[PDB]
DNA sequence: CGGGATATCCCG
DNA sequence: CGGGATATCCCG
DNA sequence: CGGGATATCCCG
DNA sequence: CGGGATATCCCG
């Protein structure tokens, strides 16, 4: 009964409850204006479809109280990019699902090079795993880790941007859980990775950012996949699989191929080819056919 | 469809409210400190036999050890163990007081702040029970940003011990008081943000007062959600005083209490002299106890 | 009221 | 050996 | 695949 | 005036 008086006007609300969307769930951090964690499940069929990111717009999540919501004004001009945790490429199968990955509840301030480079390649590896595993679960989120000074003092220091003070993480994390098949008795494979929020080149391999699940849980203050039995056999994902990202040649050729569709003049399309030859990358048959037929499309445009 | 997503469960943040004998809290597993601590104070609870000296700081056995702080994190760190739910609010129950010494109720606090200005704030909260039947208090840590001279805004705080316990830059307290369950007077509310540093006696408590809205935006919390915000709610520093004990009053009480722990006529007489050097005149309550402890020490 | 340091001793 | 319990002292 | 910029419109 | 809305252009 003495509890009733204490609770009479309600406990303070933290707003950390799980929020569910078409193909991802997340816990929001109202103080930092960023997601705490974002859970997604990707399959072979989900990463295919006609949904297009160019038909999507970054906008605040209408389900978040605006007093705790980030806004594009916080990001634009800040020097940081809007970094999706649940990637759009994992939701080509549903335009509603993809549109929800552009809510700012799924966004953190992310280094421009990191977002479009190393982190983009990690996201691609997660999708490649659907060709070798039937089911793949991914948890992603931000981190603010301490730095040891010359005097031994350990300090957490991070920037906040915009009038709403959106927190800029020092690192990003990713936890990958893969089940080979729904009928196989093969053990589950798991990996936890912590990457610094900055430009990471092609030399460092993914394993160099791998950490134990326990250490990440201690760094984040989270417990991932609680229903999972840790006594059971759980193999290291980087031992069952390669944990191998696209190299410079493969990554550059794919981007060059995709950027053919966005070429707006013959000169711009020709510069893509020039880039490949400077990189000593030979185009494949898929690139050339798209290149020549896009060239013909733009040539006809320059006649009118 | 959501079943496959949650097949192995959602990640756990561990922010659910935890209830104890005379307070509740939400724990911050990443920072290893409480996020908020709610308590209800009344005149009956602040009286009793529960003794502070019979308690020990120790890990909260309800917290997973992976996310718990430990005394090894605090000792030698240059920071004191600061309770959010004060032990002084639980003289009525030895169990409730002991629970206020769980490290789940503790944050790294400046020594002077903990024993001084923040201590006086807690005393004022208890003082409100003389004029209000019910007093609710929410206390917790904050790590607030600082605007540099070049415009960039940065959050910077120290972490101590092998477990990296977050040292807050500021502490907050939200005070809600109801005159009585019978009365129809509006409720009194006040929100205060205090820097985790030595303060002194110059500043008045109102100098640290803030809008509830602003504190909620700084902390990311919503306090007292069942409180109707459109209703009539008064500034507690208008209805009441928000006046903390001044130097003379504070020092006299400390000098009075320190008699109990004097184990020599010398250190007992030093209390008197220290009080004299500060130009404070001792009251009868101080003298009466001065004699008994003086006589008691004559005997031995 | 709120917090400490230090010597001594125990024994797994 | 070394962490931990306990007096015993101390500060604002 | 992942992210930007700038111009110009509409109209409450 | 100011926030959406498109259109066009660009980067890795
Ligand atoms: Cl990169
Ligand atoms: Cl102080
Ligand atoms: Mg991204
Ligand atoms: Mg182009
Ligand atoms: Mg205290």
Author numbering:
A (entry chain B): 57 to 360
B (entry chain A): 58 to 357
Reported in the publication:
ExoG is an evolutionarily conserved 5′-3′ exonuclease in higher eukaryotes that is localized in mitochondria. Compared to its paralog, endonuclease G (EndoG), ExoG contains an additional Wing domain at the C-terminus and bears a signature SRGH sequence (instead of DRGH in EndoG) in its catalytic ββα-metal motif. Here, we report that human mitochondrial Exonuclease G (ExoG) may participate in this particular process by efficiently cleaving at RNA–DNA junctions to remove the 5′-end RNA dinucleotide in an RNA/DNA hybrid duplex. Crystal structures of human ExoG bound respectively with DNA, RNA/DNA hybrid and RNA–DNA chimeric duplexes uncover the underlying structural mechanism of how ExoG specifically recognizes and cleaves at RNA–DNA junctions of a hybrid duplex with an A-form conformation.
We first crystallized ExoG with a 12-bp dsDNA, herein referred to as the ExoG–DNA complex. The catalytically-inactive ExoG-H140A mutant was expressed in E. coli as a soluble homodimer and purified to homogeneity by chromatography. It was co-crystallized with a palindromic 12-bp DNA duplex with 5′-OH and 3′-OH ends. The crystal structure of the ExoG–DNA complex was determined by molecular replacement at a resolution of 2.3 Å and comprised a homodimer in one asymmetric unit, with each protomer bound to one DNA duplex. As a 5′-3′ exonuclease, ExoG interacts with the blunt-end DNA by capping one end of the duplex where it forms extensive interactions with the 5′ end of the scissile strand flanking its cleavage site, i.e. nucleotides –2 to +1. Intriguingly, ExoG induces a local B-to-A duplex conformational change on the bound DNA around its cleavage site, similar to what has been observed in the previously solved complex structure. A close examination of the local base-pair step parameters, local base-pair helical parameters, and phosphorus positions show that the three 5′-end nucleotides (–2 to +1) have increased slide, roll, x-displacement (dx), inclination (η), zp and zp(h), but decreased helical twist as compared to those of a B-form DNA. These three nucleotides also primarily bear a C3′-endo sugar-pucker conformation, a characteristic feature of an A-form duplex. The 12-bp DNA in our ExoG–DNA complex has a sequence and length that differs from the 10-bp DNA employed in the previously reported ExoG–DNA complex, indicating that this ExoG-induced B-to-A conformational change is a general phenomenon irrespective of DNA sequences and lengths.
